[PDB]
Point group: C6
Chain length 188, copies 6
C-alpha cells in the first residue's frame, strides 16, 4: 500500500491498482497451501514401473502454477519498490543540501506492463491454455509405451487459473491507461 504512492500518481495508480494487487495476493494465499499442496503426492499413474511417477509429473508440470504466480507478483512489485527508495534517497539529499521523479515513475509503469505480458505469454507457451486436463498420456523413459496418469483436483485448479489470468489482464489495461494519461498530459 505504502509502496504505491507517488506525487505523480493519478487515482488509477493510487486506488484501483493497489486494490487489485492486494486482491491477487489474497487469492494466492488461500489457494496455495491447500489446492496445489498434493500436486505430486496425489498424482496417480496406472503402471508398475518404478520412477514413472516422477518423470511423468515433471514432464507435464515443469513449473507449478502457484510458483509462476508467486514469481510474477515479485517481479511486478519490484519497480514500485525501486521508486520508493529513490524518492527517500532524493528527499534525504534535498534536505541535507516533472523533473527526475517524473521519468522514474514513468519508467516503472513501462516495466510493469512488460513483466505482466511476459509472464502470461510464458503461461500460454507452457500450458497452452487455462484448462487443466483430467488425464495426461506420458511416454518418457522409463515409462513403457504410453502410461495413463491422473491429475489432482483439475477442476478447482482451472477455476483459480481463470481468476489470476483475468485479474492480470485487467492490471495491464489499467497500467496502459495510466501510461497514456501521463503521456498525453505532458504532450498536450
Amino acid at each position: 500500500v505504502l509502496g504505491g504512492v507517488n506525487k505523480h500518481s493519478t487515482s488509477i495508480g493510487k486506488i484501483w491498482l493497489t486494490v487489485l494487487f492486494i486482491f491477487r495476493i489474497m487469492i494466492l494465499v488461500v489457494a496455495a497451501e491447500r489446492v496445489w499442496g498434493d500436486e505430486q503426492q496425489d498424482f496417480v499413474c496406472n503402471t508398475l514401473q518404478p520412477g514413472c511417477r516422477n518423470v511423468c509429473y515433471d514432464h507435464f508440470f515443469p513449473i507449478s502454477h502457484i510458483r509462476l504466480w508467486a514469481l510474477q507478483l515479485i517481479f511486478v512489485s519490484t519497480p514500485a519498490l525501486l521508486v520508493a527508495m529513490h524518492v527517500a534517497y532524493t528527499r534525504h539529499e534535498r534536505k541535507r543540501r516533472r523533473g527526475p521523479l517524473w521519468w522514474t515513475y514513468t519508467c516503472s509503469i513501462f516495466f510493469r506492463i512488460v513483466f505482466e505480458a511476459v509472464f502470461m505469454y510464458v503461461f500460454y507457451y507452457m500450458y497452452d491454455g487455462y484448462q487443466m486436463p483430467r488425464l495426461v498420456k506420458c511416454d518418457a523413459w522409463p515409462c513403457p509405451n504410453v502410461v495413463d496418469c491422473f491429475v489432482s483436483r483439475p477442476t478447482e485448479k482451472t477455476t483459480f487459473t481463470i481468476f489470476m489470468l483475468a485479474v492480470s489482464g485487467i492490471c495491464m489495461m489499467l497500467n496502459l491507461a495510466e501510461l497514456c494519461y501521463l503521456v498525453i498530459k505532458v504532450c498536450l
Copy 2:
C-alpha cells in the same frame, strides 16, 4: 474494523455489519484447516481401478466449500476497501488545495448485496442444498459401471454449511435495510 467506518454510515453499518464480518472470519479460521483438511485424503472408494479416486472426488466437489467462502469474503470486503482509499485520497487533496462521498458509500452497499447473492446462488447451483451426503455414486471414466465412494465428516461439514449460509443471509438483509434507510432519508 477500520475499513468499515464512513461519515454517512449509520449504527447498522458501524456495529452490526462489522461484528458479523468478524464473526464469519472467526468461524472460517477454526473450521478450515481441521474440518476440510482431509477432504480428498480420506475420500474412500470401493474399487480397484487406478485413478477412480481422483476423477470421482473432482466430479462431486469441483470447488471446496471453504474455498468458496474464502472467495466470498474477499469479494464482499473489496467495496469497503475501495471506499476507504477514496476517502484518504479526497482528504489528502482537500487539505493540499451528501456530495461525492454519499454516492461512493451508496454504490459500495449495492455491490455488497450483489456479491452476497451471487455466491449464495452459485452454492445452490453447485451443491443443490446444505446437506452433505454420506455416499456418492460416481460413473465417470475410468470408473467401471457405478462406484460407491464415501465422504469424510459429512455431518460436521453440514453443520458449518448451515452456519455460513445463515450469517450470509443475515448480512444481506442488514445491507438491504441500510440501503433503504439512506434512500428514504434523502428522498423524504
Copy 3:
C-alpha cells in the same frame, strides 16, 4: 482484556471473568492441535469393509469436541464485542454534538448466560456425559452386523472435557452473580 471493561462493571466482570476467559483460551490452544489432531486418522475399526471407518466415525462424533468449544468461545465473546463498539459510537457522537449504557451492559450479561447454558446442554444431548469410551459399536450401513471401533486417546480427551465443563459452569455462576448484583442495587 480491553473488550471486557465498562463503567458499570464490578470487580467480578473486570477481573475474575476476564481471567477465566483467558484461562479457557489458553487450555484450548495447547489441547487442540495435539490431542484431537488424529481423531479420525487413528480411529481403528475391526473390519475389511471399505467405507465403514468413515461412517462409524461420523456417526459417533458428529461434531468434534474442540470445534464445539471454539464455537462456544466465539458466541460468548460476541456480546462483549458488541458493547465495546456501542460505547465507542456513543462516545464519538457525544463529543461531536444509568441510561442507555446500563441497559446494553445488562443485556450482554443475559445473553452470555444463555449462550453458556445452551452449549453445555448441546454437549449433554450429543455425548450424554463427559466420559469418552474406549470402544464404540457401530452398525450403520455399509458396516456388516456390528463392528468394533477403537477411539484415540480416550483418557486424555476425558480429562480436558472435565476442565472445560468445570470452567464453563463457574463462568455461568459468576455471570449470574453479577446480574443479581446490578438488579438489586438499582432496585434497592
Copy 4:
C-alpha cells in the same frame, strides 16, 4: 515479565523467579512439537490384534508429559495475572476518587506453592518416577495375553523430564523463601 512486578516484591520475585519462568517456557517450546510429536504414531506393539495399539498407549500414557507441564505453567501463572489486574483496578479507582496489596501478593505466593506441589505429586502418582521405560507390557482388552510394546525416544524424554522436575523444585524453594522473608519482616 510485566506480570511479575509488585511494589512488595523483593529481588527474588523480581529477578530469579521471572528468569526461571522464562527458562521453563523456552525449554517447553523447543521440546514439545519435536520430542513428543510422534508419541502414538511411533508406538510399536508386537501383535496382530486390531485396536491393541490404541488401548495400550492410552493405558500407559493417560496424559502426555508435555500437556501436564503446559497445564502446570498455566496454573502457576494465574495468581500473578490476578494480582496485576487487581493493581490496575485499584490504581484506576484511587485516581478517580501494607494494606490490601500486601495480602493479595502474599496470597498469590501461597497458591503458587500449592499448584507447584500438586502437579509434581500428580506426576509421581501417575508415572512413579522420572525414568521412561523402553518396554511396556500391556494386557488390557482386546490384547490377547500380554503384548510387548515399545516407546518412542525413551532416553530423550527422560532427560527433559529431569530438567522440568529440577526447575519446578527450585521454583518452590524460591517461592517458599520469599514467603518466609515477608512474614518475618512484618512480624519482627
Copy 5:
C-alpha cells in the same frame, strides 16, 4: 533495509543492492518449503535393498540447494550487520565524550565479494553445473552393482537454480562497481 545505509554509501549500495537482497530472500521463501520439501521422501530407487535409498540420496545431494543458499544469505549479510553495530557504538561514544567509518565500510564490501564468490565456487565444485538430472546411477555400499534412482521435480529445481545463480552474479558485479567507485574517488 535499515542495516544497509551508511554515510559513505552511494546510490548503488542504498537502492540496487538492497532491492536485490530482498529479491533473493523473497524467492527463497516461496521456493523452499514447497519445491525442496519432498527431496528425500520422493527419491525413488529401483531396488529391493534396504538402506540403498538413504546412501544414494546422501551421495548425490550432500548439502541441499536451499540450505546452501540460506547459508550464503546469512554470510553476505553479516558484514552489513557488523558495520551497523560499529556505527551505533561510535555514535554513542562520540556523544558521551573519511576516518574510521570509511575503512569499515570499505572492508565490509570486500568481504561481501569474497563470500559471494566462495559460495558459487562451492556450488560448481559440488554440483558441476546448474542442471539437475532426472536419473542418477549410484553404486555405493550396500547397493548391489549400479542402481537407478530418480530425482523429484528436476526441472523446477533447475529453473530456481538459474535464478539464484544469476542474481548472485549480478550482486557480485554491483559490489565490485561500488568498490571501484570509492577507490578511484579517494585516489583521484
Copy 6:
C-alpha cells in the same frame, strides 16, 4: 541485542559476541525443521523384528543434535538476561531513593565460559567427534544378533555440526579475551 549491553562492556562484548549469537540462532533456525525433521522416520534397519527400530535409534541418538544446541543457547543466554534485570532493578531503586555492576558483569562472563565448555564436552562424551556415520550396528534387545541400520542425511548433518562447533569455540575464546581485558585493567 538489547540484553547484551552494559556500561562495563567493551567492543568485543557489544559487537562481536552479539553478532556471533545471532549467527548461531540463524543457522539453527534454517537447519532444525528440515535437516533433523525425519531423523527417526527415515531411520532404516535391515530386520523384521518389531521394535528394533525404536531401540536402535534411541541407543545411538540419546539426545538429538538440534536439541543439544537449543539447550546450549538457552543456558549461555541466561546470564545475560540475569544481568539486564539486575540493572533495571538497581536503576529503579537508585531513582526511587566499578561497584556492584562490575562484579555482576564479571560473574556473568565466567558462567558463559563454563556453560560453553560443558556443552562441548558433553557432545564429545556422547558422540565422540563431529562425523556422523552412514551405518550403525546395533545389538540391543530385542534385535537378534547384530542389525544394520542406516542414518538419514549423514553428510549434511556432519557439515552443520562443524559449523556449530567452530562458532562455539570462537565464542569461548572471545569471552575469555574479554575476561582477561577486565581483570588486567583493574589490576594494573
